[PDB]
Amino acid sequence: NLWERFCNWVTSTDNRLYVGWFGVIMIPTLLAATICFVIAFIAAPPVDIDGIREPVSGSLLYGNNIITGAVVPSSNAIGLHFYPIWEAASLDEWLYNGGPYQLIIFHFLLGASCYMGRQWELSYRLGMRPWICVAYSAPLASAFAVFLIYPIGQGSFSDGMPLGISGTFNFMIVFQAEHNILMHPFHQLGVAGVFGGALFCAMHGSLVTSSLIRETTETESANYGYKFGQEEETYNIVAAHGYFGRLIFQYASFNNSRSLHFFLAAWPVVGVWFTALGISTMAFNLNGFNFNHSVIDAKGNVINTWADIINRANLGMEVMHERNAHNFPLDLA
Amino acid sequence: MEVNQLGLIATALFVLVPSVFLIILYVQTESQQ
């Protein structure tokens, strides 16, 4: 049976890269998104992102470098309308209105969801515990928040994050202008997540490296003291625990390697979950804390705080962003 | 675009001098036994 042989090949763990059924979806979508991204980043013509006939050039051939180049989001006139190639009268019209962005982000989001499913699938085929995909759900939720959920809440894929470095910075600055994300607790939890993730990464790495058991001489690298597949632990967990328990106090230190590695998984994953949820909840315009004119003296004069200085910076960004796109006093979306 | 001219050769040297250095150290490692 050809179908049985195909099923055996798809689910085979002997392939150099595992495919699986999630990979059967993942490989074509990510290949399409990757090829279209490379082509658009090099050679796409300028895109009228704001829908006001003001095309923004994001490709290398139209005057960009690596830093300033981007795949520009689709037109504000399109909004949330589905804009495939066959909906356009020609490829010139599709390129003018930012169709490549919609193609890339839709294929990428599908392929990355199937990447998460593929991680589960391979863990199941290898007899592993299944929750690496749960850890990967945090950056995937972040990608969904900036590419899909924020355009949905704001009503246009033009407000999605551009596929570029300076476009990303533009997204960040305009987002702070419109939503005050720095004062949002979910973004603060995300900063705690990534700062703590970097801290605990450096901490765990330095504590394991500090307690490596002497297996080599002074000339060779210490990494040759570990052999792949060896049964014994390559470092002294008790010595690292003794060091770190004397560094703070005994009960702030993990003596359990499993609890420590669960904490290493859990802290940045939960923090990034919260910051992705912050982006989505601000997509429905539930913004960060507003303390403008909160402190008032006895007469009634406004006493400024640091929040008022942040408000001045946000006002500068707000009045300069998309400088020709607004006709009315309130930036309602 | 009106870019800096030396930015070509600098970039080339920035690739070339370290990479071949590593390549040298790799190839002489492989010929050892």
Binding site: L60, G229 | V3, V15
Partner: peptide, 30 residues
Amino acid sequence: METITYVFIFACIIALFFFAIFFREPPRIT
């Protein structure tokens, strides 16, 4: 001239990805 440089460096990175995946040092389990 600068566009050629960026595309060349990117293509070298992709070639390096290919060699690092398919022509790696095999992890020999001891």
